[PDB]
Amino acid sequence: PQITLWQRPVVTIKIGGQLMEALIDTGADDTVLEEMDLPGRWKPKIIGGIGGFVKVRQYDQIPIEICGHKVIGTVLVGPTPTNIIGRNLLTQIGCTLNF
Amino acid sequence: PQITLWQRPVVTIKIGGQLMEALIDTGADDTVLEEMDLPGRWKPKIIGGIGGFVKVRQYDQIPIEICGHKVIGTVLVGPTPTNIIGRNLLTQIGCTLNF
Numbered sequence A, B: 001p002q003i004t005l006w007q008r009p010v011v012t013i014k015i016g017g018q019l020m021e022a023l024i025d026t027g028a029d030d031t032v033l034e035e036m037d038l039p040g041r042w043k044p045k046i047i048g049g050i051g052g053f054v055k056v057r058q059y060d061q062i063p064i065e066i067c068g069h070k071v072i073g074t075v076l077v078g079p080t081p082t083n084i085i086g087r088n089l090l091t092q093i094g095c096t097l098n099f
């Protein structure tokens, strides 16, 4: 689908048997979701953003369905204001920027 | 053009008569740039990133040339690790996401 930027590009993702909305973020190198427990085990990781660093739980090889497309990748869990879908998963669904 | 997300989506912007590299960020509602003074007058503003809140200088009605296209909008200046073009100016160049 073609999504415009007049609004925040928010899609629906399925991860862990539950549906939740996430923002499409071309500026994020990784996918950081809001603090929760995913089926698997993590490692500690520190990510840098605008105005600080945050400590997040890194869950590897997690299966996530982004808008129909089944995808697998690393997802970080932490105190983020919004669920973010970064480049690592966006490349897997074939997402491009056009102008 | 059609830009893929394997690499970071960085383009060239001319702002204030000088050209510099920036990152296309669909998650950033606003456009934030690394500290410098632009030909205009600013007012204070506090925006929040994933790490926390930060203080920036809000400059209104500044003209930018995102690779050919000439646009007009609000640019923020602050301690950001990289120059980012948010949705406020991306809509003006006709930027969309497609997968």
Ligand SMILES: C[C@H]1CC[C@@H](O)[C@H]1NC(=O)[C@H](Cc1ccccc1)C[C@H](O)CN1CCN(C(=O)c2cnc(N3CCN(C)CC3)c(Cl)n2)C[C@H]1C(=O)NC(C)(C)C
Pocket: A025, A027, A028, A029, A030, A031, A032, A047, A048, A049, A050, A081, A082, A084, A086, B025, B027, B028, B029, B030, B031, B032, B047, B048, B049, B050, B081, B082, B084, B086
């Ligand atoms: C994601 C990390 C993974 C690894 C790195 O890639 C990494 N990078 C990033 O974080 C990049 C920047 C970067 C680039 C290169 C290197 C380091 C950093 C920014 C990110 O794309 C977007 N980020 C998403 C979450 N988010 C919100 O949803 C949000 C929205 N609105 C809020 N509110 C609430 C209602 N209020 C009325 C108003 C303020 C609040 Cl608090 N928060 C803030 C937003 C952001 O930064 N937006 C701007 C306008 C402030 C700039």
